[PDB]
Amino acid sequence: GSQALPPGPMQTLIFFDMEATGLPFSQPKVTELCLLAVHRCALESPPPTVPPPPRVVDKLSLCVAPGKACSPAASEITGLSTAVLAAHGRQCFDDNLANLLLAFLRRQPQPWCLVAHNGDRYDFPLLQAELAMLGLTSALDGAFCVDSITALKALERASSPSRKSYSLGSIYTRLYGQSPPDSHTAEGDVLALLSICQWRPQALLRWVDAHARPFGTIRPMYG
Amino acid sequence: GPMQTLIFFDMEATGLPFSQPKVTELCLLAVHRCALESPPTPPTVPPPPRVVDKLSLCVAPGKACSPAASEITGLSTAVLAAHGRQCFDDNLANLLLAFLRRQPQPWCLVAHNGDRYDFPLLQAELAMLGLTSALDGAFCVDSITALKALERASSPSEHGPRKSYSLGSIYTRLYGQSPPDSHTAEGDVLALLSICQWRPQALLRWVDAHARPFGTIRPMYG
Ligand SMILES: Cn1c(-c2cccc(Br)c2OCCO)nc(C(=O)Nc2cnoc2)c(O)c1=O
Ligand SMILES: Cn1c(-c2cccc(Br)c2OCCO)nc(C(=O)Nc2cnoc2)c(O)c1=O
Ligand SMILES: [Mg+2]
Ligand SMILES: [Mg+2]
Ligand SMILES: [Mg+2]
Ligand SMILES: [Mg+2]
User: Which residues of B are known to be catalytic?
Assistant: First the structure.
């Protein structure tokens, strides 16, 4: 057989979050997503308390009509409800949304690595479920992905001897001694994750290069 | 009739129009009419609505930025190439249209000095790709024309030298401080959003009345 070319070093980190109508057991639907694409050089080749975002970034932030009610807890946490999303004329997760995500990713040099906090439990399998419901199961087979919880635990352990919270808020406070702005909004969470990842970016890129998984290996949450 | 989506819009470029400039950066921020008409029920500056769609992209211009452009925007052709940015291409044109198609029509692009800068340069970039018709479904308004019209209708007739309608000048007159960010396309779009949230009902009436089809904007150059 002809073997896969090793992807080599990740050229684009896409910091990624979605918010949903509820918890995975509910078979939730997407209400919000944010992608923030950073070139490797912005982390390999960059003093304030919280480092600023790189000047050169690509960002996409969209609200989505979920087509079912949000749980009360989900609405209180995210400040979104199905009724308000409908008052803002939001459209459901559709072929046009999938086209827009791929067009955005195609502006970035490959290989692409999606980086999401609790990506494996939440954002990655929900995105795969949304794409599977459109019959677009292969849409992101080109991409790599990392759960930043997995990455940051392995960095912490590697930079530790023999339990701390690994909530996005918790890690951020340990590093920076303040809460992140606009928490539990997709863009707020992506900006907080970027800030955490600019802490020891060389160590993070080494880990991402070694452990990035083809997105196609992520099974949909439901279906 | 009533615009359903206001898309606050800014591009940055390699230089001023006489230089036949190329896009280096663009930001679109789509707000539903109701976000301006009926904001949630004060701070010195109104907050942005919770429900927004946002797109912010850097573009490889294919030529050098002027020293003044680089200084004002903090971008250069060398830095954009270091970050592996792609030129203004069919994929970008498709991305912009797919973003607008998330929004209910009618669409109104709102850009500060849009008639001299952002609109004609956007039409120039689309025309050089052979995509002259791509965004002619949209309407557009130059916020300078809008704010001037509102101010004329809310002041005695002007005499002697006129005030600056720079983005910074308008922001400072209203809010008594500089915008948070004066160096990025996204910063300029958020500052314009804040300015347009000052008298949003009077602004929407004017927009509803005076919005132009984007297809009537001639390219900055051929
Ligand atoms: C805070 N929070 C929560 C969350 C945490 C605890 C309790 C609730 Br209810 C949460 O959901 C709030 C709505 O997303 N969930 C997600 C999330 O991606 N949930 C998904 C994805 N796919 O299926 C479920 C977040 O990004 C987030 O910031
Ligand atoms: C500050 N500034 C200026 C600007 C003002 C004075 C001097 C210079 Br040099 C400027 O250009 C800086 C690079 O965009 N120009 C634009 C602009 O849209 N220029 C375009 C668009 N199409 O052709 C030229 C801005 O958005 C902006 O905020
Ligand atoms: Mg999430
Ligand atoms: Mg989140
Ligand atoms: Mg501009
Ligand atoms: Mg500007």
Answer: 183
